[PDB]
Design an enzyme around this catalytic site. Sequence first.
Site, PDB file in Angstrom:
ATOM      1  N   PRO A   1      39.902  12.233   6.836  1.00 32.72           N
ATOM      2  CA  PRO A   1      40.352  12.633   5.511  1.00 32.72           C
ATOM      3  C   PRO A   1      41.639  13.476   5.500  1.00 32.72           C
ATOM      4  O   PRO A   1      41.869  14.290   6.406  1.00 32.72           O
ATOM      5  CB  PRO A   1      39.167  13.454   4.959  1.00 32.72           C
ATOM      6  CG  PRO A   1      38.000  12.858   5.626  1.00 32.72           C
ATOM      7  CD  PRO A   1      38.482  12.574   7.031  1.00 32.72           C
TER       8      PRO A   1
ATOM      9  N   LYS B   1      32.565  14.832   7.503  1.00 31.82           N
ATOM     10  CA  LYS B   1      33.352  14.228   8.533  1.00 31.82           C
ATOM     11  C   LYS B   1      33.708  15.338   9.512  1.00 31.82           C
ATOM     12  O   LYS B   1      33.863  16.499   9.117  1.00 31.82           O
ATOM     13  CB  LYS B   1      34.543  13.486   7.928  1.00 31.82           C
ATOM     14  CG  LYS B   1      34.172  12.167   7.223  1.00 31.82           C
ATOM     15  CD  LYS B   1      33.154  11.305   8.012  1.00 31.82           C
ATOM     16  CE  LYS B   1      32.956   9.886   7.493  1.00 31.82           C
ATOM     17  NZ  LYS B   1      34.276   9.204   7.496  1.00 31.82           N
TER      18      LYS B   1
ATOM     19  N   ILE C   1      38.605   7.521   3.975  1.00 29.54           N
ATOM     20  CA  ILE C   1      37.979   6.196   4.055  1.00 29.54           C
ATOM     21  C   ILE C   1      36.512   6.378   3.625  1.00 29.54           C
ATOM     22  O   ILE C   1      35.780   7.049   4.304  1.00 29.54           O
ATOM     23  CB  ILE C   1      38.066   5.611   5.492  1.00 29.54           C
ATOM     24  CG1 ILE C   1      39.553   5.580   5.929  1.00 29.54           C
ATOM     25  CG2 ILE C   1      37.323   4.239   5.568  1.00 29.54           C
ATOM     26  CD1 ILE C   1      39.760   5.497   7.430  1.00 29.54           C
TER      27      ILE C   1
END
Lengths: 114, 114, 114
Positions: free
Chosen positions: C1, C32, C64
Amino acid sequence: PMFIVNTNVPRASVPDGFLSELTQQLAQATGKPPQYIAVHVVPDQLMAFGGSSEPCALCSLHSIGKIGGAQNRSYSKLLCGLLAERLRISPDRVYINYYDMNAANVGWNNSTFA
Amino acid sequence: PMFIVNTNVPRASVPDGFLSELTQQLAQATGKPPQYIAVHVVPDQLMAFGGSSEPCALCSLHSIGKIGGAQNRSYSKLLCGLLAERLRISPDRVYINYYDMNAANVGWNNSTFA
Amino acid sequence: PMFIVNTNVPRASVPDGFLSELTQQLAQATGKPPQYIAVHVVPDQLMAFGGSSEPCALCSLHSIGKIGGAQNRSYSKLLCGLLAERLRISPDRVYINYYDMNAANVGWNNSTFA
Ligand SMILES: CN(Cc1cnc2nc(N)nc(N)c2n1)c1ccc(C(=O)N[C@H](CCC(=O)O)C(=O)O)cc1
């Protein structure tokens, strides 16, 4: 809406009131009230267009709706127009990327517009 | 096409030929003449990657077509190579976002490409 | 990210550690690992929001997956909070663009994530 200009033109070539003018004209052109229009001018940038370092600009307009075929020509005429007259940048040395945002993908005031 | 690099590398470590080199290598890689290529390099940025402030880059490639699974893998090699050799950035500290722009959403010369 | 903040707040008002904090907070919020998180802060910008040059910000979060109706509200609350608390920016003078990136359109280390 959110309009961003990146240009190699110097800071001192940006006329007093340019952000005000962009705000007001994007309000008119877009149909959205002035209070929703955000403007960002990034001068003195290290850039090239076609391998030449003449005055140029890379720009983006993001908006929830109000983005489409005819509207985008119309915006490009306005914005290229202003970049030529106020910043002395040839319209053929400008790119403007247009982004139609979904409301769920725009955060504001601790939430989103969805 | 349009290519933008944001990096914490200082302005003095950006070679004077880097924009042209990018311009030329992107023309070859994309199949588009150099005239269509615009390049923007933003050094001295306040950035972190993986929580470290070691040299890094956040980049974008916008193009009308010429974007896809295969091509993007290929561009990452080219661009990580240029960034590694010219700016001394480790390729694992480089993100590149790829955007396949619709012609109607790219403004240029008072109009759009549509 | 990837998270970018563009602001008219001066460089000297960004606390030491702001980048670390953002990284930490984005890791916990996205689930993440921090090593995959990049943050970019751009102060001293020439900006207006609604015609006023009071403190404001224009921001992007690219990731994503992990982008959606509810996640984006939660990210907005977190990030406006952090912009309010650390940079003294009013939440209603912040826009955040959320982008769900296809894995094949994110280049990293000589390839893509597809
Ligand atoms: C329902 N509409 C648009 C809209 C359409 N017709 C109108 N007609 C009139 N007469 N008046 C209005 N205020 C008006 N507004 C809206 C939905 C969201 C947002 C909004 O407040 N902000 C985003 C910010 C975009 C970004 O930063 O990416 C935007 O509209 O682009 C505004 C209007």
